[PDB]
Design a protein around this ligand. Sequence first.
Ligand SMILES: *[C@@H]1O[C@H](CO)[C@@H](O[C@@H]2O[C@H](CO)[C@@H](O[C@@H]3O[C@H](CO[C@H]4O[C@H](CO[C@H]5O[C@H](CO)[C@@H](O)[C@H](O)[C@@H]5O[C@H]5O[C@H](CO)[C@@H](O)[C@H](O)[C@@H]5O)[C@@H](O)[C@H](O[C@H]5O[C@H](CO)[C@@H](O)[C@H](O)[C@@H]5O[C@H]5O[C@H](CO)[C@@H](O)[C@H](O)[C@@H]5O)[C@@H]4O)[C@@H](O)[C@H](O[C@H]4O[C@H](CO)[C@@H](O)[C@H](O)[C@@H]4O[C@H]4O[C@H](CO)[C@@H](O)[C@H](O)[C@@H]4O[C@H]4O[C@H](CO)[C@@H](O)[C@H](O)[C@@H]4O)[C@@H]3O)[C@H](O)[C@H]2NC(C)=O)[C@H](O)[C@H]1NC(C)=O
Lengths: 43, 245
Amino acid sequence: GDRVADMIESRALTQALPAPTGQNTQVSSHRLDTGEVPALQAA
Amino acid sequence: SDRVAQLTIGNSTITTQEAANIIVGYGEWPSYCSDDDATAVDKPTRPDVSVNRFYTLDTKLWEKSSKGWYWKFPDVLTETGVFGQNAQFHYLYRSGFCIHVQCNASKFHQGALLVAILPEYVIGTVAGGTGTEDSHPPYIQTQPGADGFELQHPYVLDAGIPISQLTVCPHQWINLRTNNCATIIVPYMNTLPFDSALNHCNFGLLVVPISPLDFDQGATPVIPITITLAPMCSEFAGLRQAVTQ
Ligand SMILES: *[C@@H]1O[C@H](CO)[C@@H](O[C@@H]2O[C@H](CO)[C@@H](O[C@@H]3O[C@H](CO[C@H]4O[C@H](CO[C@H]5O[C@H](CO)[C@@H](O)[C@H](O)[C@@H]5O[C@H]5O[C@H](CO)[C@@H](O)[C@H](O)[C@@H]5O)[C@@H](O)[C@H](O[C@H]5O[C@H](CO)[C@@H](O)[C@H](O)[C@@H]5O[C@H]5O[C@H](CO)[C@@H](O)[C@H](O)[C@@H]5O)[C@@H]4O)[C@@H](O)[C@H](O[C@H]4O[C@H](CO)[C@@H](O)[C@H](O)[C@@H]4O[C@H]4O[C@H](CO)[C@@H](O)[C@H](O)[C@@H]4O[C@H]4O[C@H](CO)[C@@H](O)[C@H](O)[C@@H]4O)[C@@H]3O)[C@H](O)[C@H]2NC(C)=O)[C@H](O)[C@H]1NC(C)=O
């Protein structure tokens, strides 16, 4: 019993994945690449 | 997306967040010797991790009155690590290089460098001053090793060639208002596909301040220049006992 639109319009970010063992280490090679840097983080 | 980079090869990585860009010398990456080119008939060794590392070699202090330095490659690494052990056992050798020279400064310092490569950088002398006595350069001016050597007359690069057109050869600049490092990827350039690592030095890394360092007094007066290099796609052949020279 209202005509207002204010009242009629009036949650986790993380998913628990199953992890029985520690994760594997896939094969990497060298990389000589600008633009993207995986070391420099922002603490 | 160009100022920030990371170069990981071997077990050693270097991060840079004020880079210029990576230039690849003469437009091609270092690669292994194909069977169209190889003449040696023994199977080469390829260590693939233990010698493809960024070896940090030395640290030259750059003051306001410097001339310039040069390092003969690969004789900077025939005294260091598993590269220096494989190059002394094996007669033949080929590799490329990823050459990274760091020189940081504040946002009040100024000055520019020309870190450039040039292949077959042979060294002349001053010919006895007046130019009539055939003096040959000593072994330490020829091949200084990891210690480097300082240029006497950098306008002629100690070879009678002007530095004004050194910019033909693979190079990039370190001016302290824009970047702090300079990556130069160099392939293997030589006529014959392998060569000796103790006699022949394929190229020399000229690092010359063209625009001099300047800073008002009160800032940090010690501005180092450290060069790190990584032999890429290196392979050796012809195993015998250790020679050192
Ligand atoms: C016998 O007899 C004989 C005769 O005499 C003797 O001999 C002697 O010996 C002695 C001992 O050795 C001596 O003394 C010494 O000397 C030295 C040298 O001096 C010189 O040289 C210099 C150099 O310069 C350079 O650098 C600069 C900068 O720094 C620049 O600028 C320039 O340009 C140059 O550059 C170059 O080089 C470089 C190298 O590295 C390169 O790299 C580049 O490239 C280029 O090439 C010079 O400078 C000087 O000069 C002088 O002189 C002139 C004249 O002409 C003038 O003008 C100038 O100015 C000067 O003067 C000033 O200075 C000085 C000092 O130097 C003083 O002394 C005076 O007084 C004035 O002030 C010359 O030539 C020296 O080094 C030394 O000193 C030291 O010690 C003392 C005491 O011992 C003290 O006091 C001082 O301080 C000093 O200390 C320092 O150092 C150390 C070591 O190094 C250190 O460790 C310490 O830590 C210190 O540091 C500190 O402080 C500083 C300040 O200073 C600062 O900065 C820092 O940071 C820190 O903090 C000594 O003095 C002498 O010389 C001789 N003689 C003659 C004549 O010479 C004998 O001995 C007898 N016998 C017996 C037994 O006794």
